Design a protein around this ligand. Structure first.
Ligand SMILES: Cc1cc2nc3c(=O)[nH]c(=O)nc-3n(C[C@H](O)[C@H](O)[C@H](O)COP(=O)(O)O)c2cc1C
Ligand SMILES: Cc1cc2nc3c(=O)[nH]c(=O)nc-3n(C[C@H](O)[C@H](O)[C@H](O)COP(=O)(O)O)c2cc1C
Lengths: 185, 185
């Protein structure tokens, strides 16, 4: 039932180095809304989802389904439903792969954490996406994709290489001292 | 306002390799509830939080505060409040560092994604933790830590090296085919 935990320890200098380099890698991640049609390796899509499935989960429920859509007709119906919901996105057609992350019904926090692992793994693998959370489209997309009544759409990620002429808005991230507070005394 | 996006592309074989190795790294992550007192480098804690601050966020609000507690007396008061809340955890005292992640009030999904990046960065850096979400203790911990009324506690992570005699429950993760569904046609 309980087993000894096996752990790799690095010297302090190597911990500093590794953590600096991983930060630098992740800092290069941007939401990209111009995604090339070019095919991406399906072993890579598999490996990023396996990475996501490593996440912690409340009561070890692993309450996530990663729904992968490549079919051009289906990706178009997804786009149509999302656009219709206004009621007052070309990358949904152009991206070779869509990943839709459904929570099985602290499941929402567990599944969002898994999506953070997925985002890191895409960056590490040299792919891009834009995080979207079309929660109001959830019921219609669930039905379109034949997902059971116990799943609820959380996140939709179009995945591919960036367009050769992709742009991003010129946003700056907060400095460490704007996000980190140390309690003293 | 908009700038060309700069992107590193790897050959397909290198994408496969990188994504496999990152999965293998993350697969080694376990929730560890036996954390050594041994000091951990503060540059590493900084670098894991910087990594977390890379996350996407709804409307680029970056709505996260990472509250770092090292002080033994304060860590004990945190433990006392959590234990009192039953109403029907020694690692909160033993861990050299606690990180409490507060959301600034899709902020909850954005902040949970940042916590997935934080968990990956801790694993990469050779540190361990156990994800906890003491949401019912949120109001009392907010006051104890002098956090403003616009922050809401989401996640508490005790951080350190694992105990030399740490154990974990013998859980198996789901295989890829248990978490991934491909829509055809
Ligand atoms: C929960 C969440 C929902 C988001 N929804 C959208 C969306 O509906 N449309 C969109 O273009 N971007 C969406 N984004 C992307 C953000 O606009 C983006 O993360 C933010 O502008 C910061 O840019 P960056 O990801 O390049 O750092 C979303 C991000 C989060 C995490
Ligand atoms: C949202 C969330 C809340 C959790 N809360 C607790 C907690 O209250 N106490 C605890 O011991 N573990 C908690 N965990 C850890 C889980 O029990 C753990 O992730 C699960 O058993 C799987 O083990 P693993 O993380 O080693 O893969 C929590 C995990 C998640 C993601």
């Amino acid at each position: 039932e309980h087993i000894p935990f096996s752990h790799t320890r690095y010297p302090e200098q190597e911990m500093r180095m590794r953590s600096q380099e991983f930060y630098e890698l992740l800092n290069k991640r941007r939401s990209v809304r111009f995604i090339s049609s070019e095919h991406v390796p399906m072993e890579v899509i598999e490996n990023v989802i396996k990475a996501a499935g490593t996440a912690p989960s409340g009561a070890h429920t692993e309450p996530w389904t990663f729904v992968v859509v490549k079919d051009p007709d289906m990706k178009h119906k997804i786009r149509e439903i999302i656009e219709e919901e206004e009621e007052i996105k070309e990358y949904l057609d152009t991206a070779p792969v869509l990943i839709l992350i459904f929570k099985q019904v602290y499941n929402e926090i567990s599944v969002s954490i898994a999506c953070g692992l997925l985002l890191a793994a895409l960056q590490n693998a040299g792919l891009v996406t834009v995080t979207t959370t079309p929660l109001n489209c959830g019921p219609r997309l669930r039905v379109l994709l034949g997902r059971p009544s116990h799943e609820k759409l959380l996140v939709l990620l179009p995945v591919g290489y960036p367009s050769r002429d992709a742009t991003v808005p010129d946003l700056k991230r907060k400095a460490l001292d704007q996000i980190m507070v140390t309690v003293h005394h």
